[PDB]
């Protein structure tokens, strides 16, 4: 039950964990997300494993439409994941 | 480090299991939300002990002005909180 903040500084370690090859500032491109999401979200969001799932999330994050997740753009993926976890009927 | 999708699923049952009263529907108001806040995220959000910062970030989510927080709400609690977490600075 009580987690205190694990979950939420250990999402932060688990993205820069997964995501960690980056250029020259922390870019963190669709290569590093879809890494994450297909091993760690695989059961949470709807086909996760799907690239085209996975651009539609991506894209959703970077509204920048530059190609670049950064931990406040996977901290609206978290908001597309924590919502196919309790929505987990399919949040799309 | 890998967690799955413990984190997500995670975050979704604490959120029912510190806001578990509400209403007829889950309306879950800022009295489920600063409880689960000051206990669990006290060392995360900048004085989310402050009922005045738990507002701010309460407002936040309930942009429907309706004092209800659902697990999408709190899904942007959590955009406050992951944000918090890495930029541990003070998200504010």
């Known amino acids: 039950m009580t987690k205190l903040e694990e979950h939420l500084e250990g999402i932060v370690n688990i993205f820069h964990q997964y995501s960690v090859r980056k250029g020259h500032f922390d870019t963190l491109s669709k290569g590093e997300l879809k890494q994450l999401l297909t091993k ?46 309790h929505y987990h009927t399919h949040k799309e």
């Open 40 to 85: 760690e979200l695989a059961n949470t969001i709807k086909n996760i494993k799907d690239k085209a799932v996975i651009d539609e999330i991506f894209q959703g994050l970077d509204a920048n439409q530059d190609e670049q997740v950064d931990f406040q753009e996977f901290i609206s993926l978290v908001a597309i994941a924590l919502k196919a976890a």
